[PDB]
Design a protein around this ligand. Structure first.
Ligand SMILES: Nc1ncnc2c1ncn2[C@@H]1O[C@H](COP(=O)(O)OP(=O)(O)OP(=O)(O)O)[C@@H](O)[C@H]1O
Ligand SMILES: [Mg+2]
Lengths: 268, 263
């Protein structure tokens, strides 16, 4: 819309719906800083607000109440701070009810934002989380333009049973559609190899980085953070996927150099 | 030695999905000063209630209690040098925050606890949870090393008419103690710094704008200066000028929410 007046509200290119930790580097707590480094602005709508990841001996907090979550999304439209919105990334969701609301918000939002790149990360592994899969299939999946599932995630989501490249690539294809343009499947195979397969309607690219064995969390969230930034900045999908992975590696090293059990972002 | 993240400051206040108030503005400000901080939200609103709409609420007592205990169980307070408190949500939250602080004193005796008695304005009266004022005076004040209340917030804390500069100074003086080393009264723009042995009246430009969060910016900047080695009055004057600065940039930017310009 060219005929729209100037909005005195803040603007952001991305709305990241993920978890938030007071202490830690996961979800938006690590995503937002990363996006900010790429020179982009972002609004972070938490799914859950925890003291830290449930991976430590103790953690506190819970899932954001629907009325709240619902309001947070709505408010953004009312404050009129979505003119520059070019993408919406979804990470760890706390409940299926949240996914439905987000899907409702996204459906209505697309009507005005056609270039809206709804990237979705199918976090369904704690075997599977209850009710979360169907919610994804019915609400988010149909809207997602890109999905970054891992072997497992892709397996339960597609019901298919990937056992080899072709299989994993085939399942990916089955998810493509008029809306879903790509599927970035990843797998962590000491020294942990990170195998990534980029699948689209007219091509299948592959990338493979060697990774440091660690208990560091948020690497996936960080990856998605740099994936989306690389894309909103013009990089080719497979180019953005490659870099993103290199960036995550640069971060994990830097993090281990300072011997930190939680990710630390070094200048980008 | 610890491998856990560390922070010089722990900011306990409001958080908004959209807007520049509470830790939303304070954290980024603290970062600009090259300091680490852990933000513990007391309320998680969509935006400030000064808008047509707003959603969200107070963080549950168990959550709030946990966020604090977590910082300890995680052992990320090895470098803790100050704790700032801003917009609180409930008196139960302040009471919990107080106990937590009384605990930290045992292993952080030099701790600089700075509280912003967000209770009301002279042109609004008490605009927060009615129970907060009592909770402040009862639990938080006793721990505070320094506080930053406005004329009205000072009347509610001391129960004295602070409309007169001298009467206000007097009210502030009576508050000082072995714990409370200073009181930055607020009300161009006049900012009075009161210490057991002195009184400084700082005054800078004033802008007619309904920009919210400036208070939180002030404290975030004030605390940074104190921790960065600046003397009290100098820190108070710098924090105030920074805020004046920020608002000019925001207005210049034709925006209704604060925007941090490079420091
Ligand atoms: N419109 C303004 N013009 C100039 N300085 C301002 C303005 N608004 C805020 N400030 C600066 O911010 C400081 C404190 O913030 P603010 O005035 O919002 O809080 P307050 O209601 O006086 O009290 P508190 O410290 O509880 O927020 C002021 O005293 C001043 O130094
Ligand atoms: Mg105030």
């Amino acid at each position: 819309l060219l005929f729209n007046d100037k909005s005195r509200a803040l603007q952001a290119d991305i709305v990241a719906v993920q978890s938030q930790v007071v202490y830690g580097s996961v979800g938006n707590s690590i995503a937002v800083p990363a996006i900010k480094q790429n020179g982009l602005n972002v609004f972070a709508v938490p799914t859950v607000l925890l003291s830290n990841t449930p991976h430590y001996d103790t953690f506190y907090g819970g899932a954001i109440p629907d009325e709240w979550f619902s309001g947070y999304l709505r408010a953004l439209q009312e404050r009129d701070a979505l003119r520059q919105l070019r993408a919406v990334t979804t990470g760890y969701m706390g409940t299926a009810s949240q996914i439905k609301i987000l899907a409702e918000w996204l459906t209505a939002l697309r009507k005005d934002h056609p270039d809206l790149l709804i990237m979705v990360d199918p976090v369904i592994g704690d075997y599977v989380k209850p009710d979360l899969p169907e919610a994804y299939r019915q609400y988010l999946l149909p809207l997602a333009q890109g999905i970054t599932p891992n072997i497992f995630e892709l397996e339960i989501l597609t019901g298919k049973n990937c056992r080899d490249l072709d299989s994993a690539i085939a399942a990916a294809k089955s998810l493509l559609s008029d809306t879903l343009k790509w599927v970035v499947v990843t797998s962590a195979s000491e020294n942990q190899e990170m195998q990534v397969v980029v699948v689209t309607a007219d091509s299948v690219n592959v990338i493979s980085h060697s990774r440091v064995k660690t208990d560091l969390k948020g690497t996936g969230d960080l990856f998605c953070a740099q994936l989306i930034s690389g894309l909103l900045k013009g990089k080719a999908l497979t180019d953005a996927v490659h870099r993103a992975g290199l960036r995550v590696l640069e971060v994990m090293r830097y993090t281990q150099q300072h011997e930190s059990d939680e990710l630390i972002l070094p200048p980008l």
